[model samples]
Structure formats: C-alpha cells, structure tokens
Target: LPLRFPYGRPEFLGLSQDEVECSADHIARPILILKETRRLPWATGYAEVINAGKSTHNEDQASCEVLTVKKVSCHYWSLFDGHAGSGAAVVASRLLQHHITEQLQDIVDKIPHECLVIGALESAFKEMDLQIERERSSYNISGGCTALIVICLLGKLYVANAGDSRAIIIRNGEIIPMSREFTPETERQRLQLLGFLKPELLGSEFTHLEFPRRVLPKELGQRMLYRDQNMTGWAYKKIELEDLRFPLVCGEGKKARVMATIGVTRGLGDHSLKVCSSTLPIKPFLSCFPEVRIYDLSKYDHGSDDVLILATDGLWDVLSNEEVAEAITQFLPNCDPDDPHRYTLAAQDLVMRARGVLKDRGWRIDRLGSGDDISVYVIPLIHGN
Candidate 1:
C-alpha cells in the first residue's frame, strides 16, 4: 500500500512542514518536546533531538497510540532506532501499531489469554518485516532499525524489544529492566551457530570461531586460545589454514560486529543489507522476533513520580538506569505535581542531560553526553488524578 503517513517527525510534535525540515538541524541540535496541551494517554511525555553529525537527519522515531479493542482501550508506545537509513525507522514507527491492533482483533471481550496476546505481539513484528520486505521494490524503505514497544492492556504492561533500544520501569527507586540489548556481543553464540551450521552463508570469507587475536599464517601448527558456538570458556586449539579466516563475530562492546558489519544482531528490516568482504546477506542473522516481558500493574502501587522510561541507545549510552531515575526524581519534585506537563519537562531534562552543550566549534561534555540521536519517553504510572 501507499505510505500511510507523510514523512515528518511524530504527529504529536505538531511541527509544520517547514518546521519539520528545520528539526533536522544538526548544528543547533534542537530538542523537540510534547506540548503541555498535547498530553497523551497516561500523561506520557516525549523528547528527541538530532545527532551531533552522525546522519543527515535524526533516524530515530516515536509513536504513541490509544486503541479501543472491543471492550477496553490499550495504550501503545514505540521507539525506532534506525541504522544505515531512516526509511525503515519512519515506516516502522508509523505502521507497527496497526499490525498490533489487527493481530489483537481476535481477543475476547471480557478477558483474553495472555498467551494469545504474547504470540499476537510476536507475530506482529514478523508481519511488519514481511510487509517491509514485500514493499522494498515499490518503496524507498531502506535499512533496518531496533524496535522497542510498550503495550498496556488488561491490567498488564507488555514490553517487546527486538534490538538495543530499551524500556525500563522505575518504581520505589528500583530499576526494572524491561528489555535486553541485542548486540553482536550479546547474541554471539546464536550468530556463530548460524554461521557454523550454514557455512555457505559465510562464503568462505569468514569463520564461525573466536580467538584472542587474529590467527596468523606464521602461527600455523601452533596451539592458540579460541572459542566456538557451544563453548563460553576459551580452549586451546591447533591453528590451521581454516583458522586463518576472520572470526564470524569480531570487535567488542558497542563496536562488535557480525561478518565485520552490523553491530546489532536483531530487529526488523536489513533484508537488503550485505557485508563488504563476503557479500553475504545480513538478514539471515538479524531477527524479527522480540523478547516480550510482562509486568503486572495490579501488583505494584505507583507513586506520582513512578515512570516507565522508553529510550533509544543514545540516552542509555550516556545515562544509566540509576542516573535516569535520579534525574527524573530531581526534576519532577521541582515542578508542580498538579502540572500535566511535568513529564514533558522531565523528558526534556533527559534529552539535555544526554545531549550536552555544543560550543563555538568544540562540542563540550563528552564525559556524560551522547553524540548520537537521543529520544526519550517518560510515562507516568499513576494513571489519573
């Protein structure tokens, strides 16, 4: 189908066409926030800014929606961290909720099985990818993105994550992790196992093995420390010509990569991505399935300050869960509790804290600042007054 929504920032930003183009300013690094009158369901607040100079535009995108399913209304929020290009991010952000709502149409009026809900949520991600796959020839949908989605339904909160973008719950000063980062390092074995079983996917240019250092030709017939898909601990192995190829998974921490390309191991899209050395497709390794975690809202009492913070890797890269909790706590109390936009102010504070000052040439505060695109959502837990 044709693009459902025109290309622009989130509708909630209320940006005019010119303003939407202006929002891409990399130099000024404008932080966009939800207006006080634009309060979303559950007093949700959002903030975002372009990267220092990473891409032409901010590839990150957000969506917040409230859908009535037969008897009850469900709250939905999502974040997309685009890489390689922004088209996938924009498409996913605009269309994901529809896939969800459509998938959930089979729900019972009074009560529904959480099992069906879980599978419905899971298949929604797959369906989105399939649609993106089918539309590539007809549309400019490019690259891939990490997806983080939160669905509040039936007295429970379902957080589904497919990549590094994160969602966390902060209540009673406790930091509850709602998602896991699916980096090359985090999902090494899965990638390695795929490469091992399907060696043709590597094109003989990569090896599904790990080593302390690059295996050298001179070290042939020598024993070296190495690891494999099944083994977590290192073991000594005889070096041979086969061991000379580069490891399927390389680099460390944030820089880790698969086939020496693509840092992330999961998410939607990337079906067209290929590695330079091997010319191997990357989507075989990238996943469309998200790890869904459920949080029962009835079990916990939320204070006025309690919140669920949804953010891209940019915010978490600079600020830890503890730091975010600290910042929100410090910010909310200073604002009037009765103000509906306190969450908006708090969200803005988070973006500012992560994206520090850009001075007369030199960007300052590298220690705590994130140079990447930053987006944040501070959703209050206490629903109503």
Candidate 2:
C-alpha cells in the first residue's frame, strides 16, 4: 500500500512554481531538454540535463537508445556521472549500450532460449572497461564515471548500477527502488572481504580495519577499540604498527572514497587513477562489475502515472523518495490525457524543483540547486500501446 502522509507546503518542499529566479551567469552549457512521443518503439519519456559541475564543460552524460532484433524490441536508458573529466562519461554513453546490444545479438542467435541477460550485461561492462583502457591513448581519456543503466527486453526490466546513480519506479503510487547505490560505506563488507583475502592488494600502504583514528606505536600495549574482519561490532585490540596506515576505504555517504581517493566503489575506467603518487592503483580496489536487478514487467498491472525515474546523485542527494513521488503525482494529476508531452514536462518540473532559481546570493530555494551536474529521465510504462 502507498504510504499515507500530510503533504508538506510548497515553499517548504521547494515545489512552488509561482516564484522564480534567473539562471546563473556561470552556467556554461545550456540545460538540455528531451521530450519524445514514440521516439522509440517501446517507450515514451523525457530527459533533462543541467551542467552544474565546477568545470565550464559538463561531465555528466545521458542516453536513450532503442534497438530491435528478430521481431523483439529492446530499449536502453542510462546516466553516467563523470569526475576529473567528461571523456569517460561521453565514451561510455556512446559505446556501452552498443556493447550490450552486440552481446544481446550474439546471445539471441547462439543461445536461443537462455535467460542470461544479467551475465551479458556484466560481460559488456568489463568489455567496455577494457576498451577504454586500450583507447585511452588515442582518445586522450582520463578520470572515471558512475554508470546507471536500465534495459527493457522481452517484457522484463533490467536495472544495472555501478555507482550512486539511482532509479526508482512509481507503481500504483508506491515507490519501488530499482537499483542500489554502490558507495564505499554500503559495500564496506565486500571490500573488507577482498582486502582480507588478498592483503597484498592493500599494497602494504593501507589497512582494511575501521578505527577511531590511526593506531600509533606509543599505544602498542594500550588496548584500543577497532572493527576488523573477525568482528561485526567494535572490539578492543592491541594497537599494532600495521594499523597506522589509512583504512582501505574512508568517510561515509557522499564523502566515502576508496583509498580516500575515488568517490565511487564501482564504475568504468579510472585505470590510471592512483593515490597521492603511490604505486598502488585505484583500479585494483574499484570494480567495473555492476549490480544487476531484474523486475518482471509482465507481472505488474500498469497505471497511467506509473513511471521509472533514472537520475544521477545530484537529484537523490537532496530529494527523498517520497518527495519525488509527491512531486510527480502533484504535477501530473492535472496533465491532459491526450498531451504526449506530459511526461517531459513532469521531468522538467522535477529537475527545476531541485535546481531552484539562482538568486543574488545563491539559489532562492537553498536546497533546490544541487550544485552538481544533474541528469534525469522519466519513463512511463503504458501497456498495449
């Protein structure tokens, strides 16, 4: 059942559309708006991208591409948030989907009746990573990106995420999360497990245990509290010289970075990423494998307002799941039934709400402007269309 609530006021919620502020002068790239009616064989939706990165050039990338094979239709949607440079994001946006499509083509022809789409996606991501490494010299690519992809094929929805980008579905007014955000904090155990199995991976430069602070030789005999591979909860242990190095991963939430260097735990590229001139490579700790989630669209009954929302961290950082649902339901309730552009308007409104107008000092609605490159895709499921 949908959660009941006393909806918050417009001003408090940053949903008021009456008051507006002018755009900032430093918006180097114009906001990108995409609205399509039957743009693809399978779905109709809208996309909006705002350049909010520190660099004048936007690093965020988005994609909405469709393909058909042997009387079966497939659709792909994705968002790639880049850091350090936009090269990786741009390359992934252009080539990753093609990689997946090529894999799908091979699978359908050779396997015929197997349900191994997840495996296909996993292999494709790895392939894309290798391709990036091989072509970096020619393309002059640097840095990395967090990838979020949603695939619709043979009546199922496959949502794959490599970083913090999120995708949520509003089905019959209930919010359903489609992908998991891969951050250092959330994947601590898995990372710790890797560190435990291969201590050499730490490069003798870092530790995998959690401590209040770095352990010192002076406190060698002193019992200090720590969390290690053996303990689920914190326990006291004798301070060891090995614990003086920084933890393999540090910080929490958005602040979390593997080796205290890269922000995301999984994604593509970053093959050359290193920590503070150390020989230890960040790619050793980072993963290109995405967590693939499956949702059977054939099982659910469709509703007019039911939609899938794919967005970068900029949108989810400030807006809660409930707040997003409320925004869509509120703005879409009055949408004309015949208007094909309704979904696009809904997406534009959502991005605008998060990107409140630029004022004399800052955004009028302080929380609205994410101050990060924001990209959003709103996909509505209409069966038998």
Candidate 3:
C-alpha cells in the first residue's frame, strides 16, 4: 500500500477537497498503490511509486507522461521525459539512481553526509551520459530525454536537472522556479551560435549546416541568427527569412536556397549535429546533463509547509505559476496527509483541469490535455511529521 494524505489531513495543510480532486476517477479511486517492486528487495523498500500517468500523442510520436515516486530518507528519486524517442528517458530511469548509489556507496563511510550524497548524484549523471558514447550503438540521435532528480538525505533535499524538465518549490503559496531549460533558440545563446556578419547580404533563408566550415569566419564558429537587414537582437523579421533565400548576388548560376534550422538546442542523444567527436571523455552540448538542487526543510517556517513540484513542460504549458499555486492552496484544505492520496488528489486535480471538463457549456474534449507526456512529483511539506 502506498502512503496517502487525506483532505484536511493534518499532514497536508493549506489545501481543500475541490482543489485537490480534479477528476472523477481521481476523486473516486479509493486505493492508491505506490509500489516500486522493480528494484531489488532491499532497495524496493527504500523507494516506492507515488502516482503515475501516461498519455500518448494523438497524431505524432510525441506522447508524454509523468511518474511520481518517493524514496527513503537519505535515498533518491528521479523524473524523465522522452522526446523524438523514449530511449533516453528509459535509459535514465533504469540506470541513473543505481549509478548514483554506486558512487555514494563508496564515500558514505568517509565523507560528510550532505556533501557525499549531493556529489554522488551529480557525478553519476555526468558519468552515465558519457558512458553512452562507449556503447557502440546507433542513436539516430532520435530518442532524447530531459530529467529532474531529487535526493533527500540527512534532512536536506537536493534537486538537479538538465535539458528542459523543470522543478519548482512552493511555500507560503508562492512558486519559486529552479530549473534551467536548454532550448536551442533562446536568445543570447542563439546569437552566439547563429548570428553572423557576412560581406554580402542574402535573403534570410539561410541554414548554417549548408555552409562549409571553411566558408565560416574563424570567429563565427556556428552561432548565427539571420534577421532582416533592418531587424536586430533575438527578435525575428520576416525579411530575414527571405534574405536567407536570396543572397545579394545569385553568383553566376547559384539558385536561391532556403534556410535550415536545428530543431532542438541542448539535449541527450542528439549526436548528429555535434561539431567534434572526441575519443576521450568530454562534455558535449547534446548530452543529458542534469542540474541538481538542494532544499533545506529547516529553512521554512513549518518544516512540512513546503511543497516541491518537479514537472516537464507538458504540465507547465497548461498551468501558469499562479494557477498552480492557487490550485494547491484550494486542494490541501480537505486532504488527509496520512492517507497517501492527499498528494495524488492534488496532482490529479491540476492535471484534470487541463482535461477541459470544466469549460463552458460547449466545451471541447479533444482540446483537453495537450496529449504530451506529462510527468510530475509533489512533495508536500512534511518530513514524517
């Protein structure tokens, strides 16, 4: 049986029934089982499933889902999202926690409790990603994954992530965003990779991969963003796209060429776009490098009043910061913290609204959830309180 917190349950404060129970099935499901028998017995007891949901993409290979789990104090838990392919996410899920444990197991007897655990979590992620290159497998670079991980040990919470998956902390009804998204086209980065000054102005329809390495100015590297001659900064101008197609001169018989763009910027498994392939271990921009974080429960007014949510963009896309904060506030009022379902109730409610059932009389069901893999974990503020 999984642990569940009930509505108005003393363990989960500041939430209400309506706020937490967002779906019929969510509200009616009397029993919520959080079992992680996947791991060995000793480890199985250390971790257990909390809540899980998976939704396939309606039209494309873009299905999205979320998994929520809890590990023993001084243990670890993680979340992953599969994109273009689920391979990376599956790899992370299967190997990351154990890999970190392997590293921590060594220093556990010698290092300080806090430092040892945090260090292990970070190093394992770095090592595992690099280890992939040695496998001699073909990734097609298609299956990429973004991950967010949390480790709770000796009264401290450590969180880290890489790629686009995000983690946020909520206390006193406010949302604190804590994850970094490594999208390829987010401003300054785009400039560094794509902005270039050419002797001849062409229409904006240019793709960097088409240009030969020698043709690129030594200083330009690969970062160039083409806006119309009159446009500037990260902003885009329609004319710039045009400039890429028709350079100032057609040059003898060179025909107009269209622009090409790399779909995603930084992620795990995008091996094709790599500029340099090194035999020695090194950091590449496309690998899955998680960002780890720590939250000291002692810092909050009530050690148990804090709520931590780590979710992929699929969930965040439909719910704004304020919206989530409000929903949690409304749902906790009637929850039973000891029942284990309290957290589930709250999570389901928020995701359910994204289902669009409460819309106007003429609501559209097909327009409900984004249909992307939506994964999330909510740590209600209470450490065995």
Candidate 4:
C-alpha cells in the first residue's frame, strides 16, 4: 500500500473532502479517512512488536492499542515484563489490554470527570497485577520481571511502570521519563514474600552479615532480605537487581535446598541452580509495585506535540531513555504506517542507531547484539483542543 494515499503527489497527502469526492468519479483509490477527522483536534494512532534476543529465550513482552472516547481517542496501555522466557511477559501484556477494556466498559461515563479515565487506568493495573499473582501457578515460571506502559487519550497522556523497562515522551526537543525504574533497593524496600528469597551464608571471613542457624523440620521457614543501599560490582549487567538473591518463594523445601547450595535467597531464574520444578517453593520474586502518573494536556494553556514511545531493554541498553525518545520524535515526521514495511523500517532504525551510540561510547565490545527481543511503539500527536 502507498504510505500516502491518492499517491500521485505529495500535496495529496491530507486529502480534502472535495478532493476525495471529485476523485471518486475518475479513480478507484481506497478512501482513507473521512476528511473531517484529519483536520479535527482529536487524532488516533498505534504501533508495536516483539523480537527474539541473543538469549535462547526472548523474555520480553509488550502491548499497544488505540480507542475512541467521548468523541476523541485513547491509546492502549500495556505491561512488558517476563521471565523463565518471554512467554510470561506476552501473557501479562495481553491481559493488561483486556483489563483496560474491562475497566472502561464498566465505567463509561459513570464516574466524576477528573478521576474517571485516569482512575480506570490505575485500577486496571492493580487488578491485573493481582490476577497475575493469583494465577501464578498456571504459568509455572520462576522469575521476576520489568514493565513499561503508555496510555494516550486525546490530549492527555498517562504512563506507568515498574522494573526497568522505560516509557518516554518527546517534548520541547528533550526526553521526559514517565515513571521511576524500580530497583531491588529503592527507598522503602520491603521484605520480599516468603519462599522467594534466601540470604547468603555468612562466610568464615565475614561475621557482620550472617544467616541465623535455623533449619526447617516439616517445612523451611521463609524470610525476606531487602537490600539496604546501592552497592557496586556483580550486577553491572542487569537493570534492577544489585544481586540475584531476591524475590524467591520456597516450595516443598526446594527453596531450602537451593538456598543451602547457593547461599542467597530470592531471584527470578538462576541458570546455575538448574532446579525449576513445580513442587519447588518458587513464587513471583521482586514485588516492585508499579507506579503510574498522568500528564493532563487540559491543564496546559499552550499546545504541545508529544510523542510517547515504549521499548524493552534491547534498545535501552545502548541508548538512554532520552535518546530513544529523541529518535522517535526525529524520525516520526516521515513515518508512514501505510508503508508495507513501516514496522520493519522504524524498528530497525531505532535498534541500529542505538547500537551505533554504544559503539561511539566505546561499549560495543561489551554490548551484546540483539540479546533480547526488541519492541518499539511510537504515537505522534496532531493538534486537538
């Protein structure tokens, strides 16, 4: 399909009603949108994808959507986090979209204006996360994850996140991060759920940090070890954890056995343990509660064209959140979804440019190539009141 419709000339890009009407008499070009909406204050759009990374598994998940609301539009919001494999992230991402629909349908014009829509977004994440925890047994994956989400409604935009996945907005020629990236030791770090984490055995050389000499008779007791401060070394490769000993749940004494062998407690998946069994005391690790924030365009007297972008660490490892956001804003002026290879072209450019930045920074040798599936969704803004 032609990226721009009525493809003969660039001037024909935004078809006027008269042009569409008159052209119908001579040409059989597919009518794009009714001309009225093109010029209207409200505009709707969407984009998304999942790519396998270098790891044998692509444990990343993402989702995107667009909807009509009160005669305007709404963008789909999603959660992108996975472990064991990308399967969990995919499942979680799909559920988030459905939950949003459920929330909207349940409240269509029922609540007071100020809190209605944004409330639905926040509440949907709460309900979905709870459901994921409840249904954890069904997936049987033993690991934690990261998340990124974007929700665009008319002129307002809402973004929420947890873990390290990021959401960005390009405004005033700069990148604005939408949410805080949760780490194992962010302020108010609470004990992980029992059975999920085990503290390492205080070695012969170290006495300051030691696990009590307690053993389980019928079942091993569970404990939580919240990190106290940011420390250097070890987890330089990961976005969140300072150490792998976090977010573990003991099951059938397997956690106890694993703890005895490795020392530290709590982690998503450990390749060294090689002991993932249904009967193991494994539960969702890292309970990094998701944070949500809203930016109301209604509050601003001046108009702004904002580009909201969501992506997994595949693009993030090489580029700062600001850099990724900048790329989208820079390239979107000519982005055409109607282009047959639009997704391929846009995703590749973002990924490759990110890699180039890594090379320029002298991190190419340490940078991994497509180690995880990459996903990017860009939403462009058109003026609306």
lDDT of 3 by residue, 1-385 (tens): 2111111111112225653243213212222212322221111111111122332211011111122233322445566665644445555565666666667666665556776666776677776666544431533223456667776655676777765566777788777876766553332233223324532211233332222121333433334434333234344223323233322211111122112222233445434332223231112324455555667767756433356766666566567778877877787677654545566556666555443443453222356543444555566656522
lDDT of 2 by residue, 1-385 (tens): 2211111111111323322122222453234454252343234454444455465545677766676644146788878888877677878877888788877776674543435788889888998898988888666665789999988877788898998889999887799999988888888878877888888889888898877676676786788888776566888887778888888867867877778887778999798988887888778778889988888887877777888888888778778889999999888778885566677777777777776677765643345466777777788776422
lDDT values, one for every candidate:
0.86, 0.73, 0.46, 0.44
Q: How are the candidates ranked when ordered by lDDT, highest leading?
A: 1, 2, 3, 4
Query: Please, what are the lDDT tens digits per residue for candidate 1 over residues 3-49?
Result: 43466788788888899788888788899999777878888989998
TM per prediction? 0.95, 0.86, 0.59, 0.55
> After superposition, which runs of candidate 4 have C-alpha atoms over 4 Å from their true positions?
1-54, 67-73, 110-119, 133-145, 191-285, 298-305, 325-347, 355-370, 383-385
TM-score of 4: 0.55
Q: Give candidate 3's error at residue 307 in angstroms.
A: 1.4
* lDDT minimum window of 10 residues, candidate 3: 41-50
Identify the superior model by lDDT, candidate 1 or candidate 4.
1
lDDT for model 3: 0.46
Report residue 235 deviation for candidate 3 (angstroms). 12
Ten-residue stretch with the least lDDT total in model 2: 3-12
Query: Candidate 2's error at 126, in angstroms?
Result: 1.2
Model 1, residue 334: displacement in angstroms?
A: 0.7
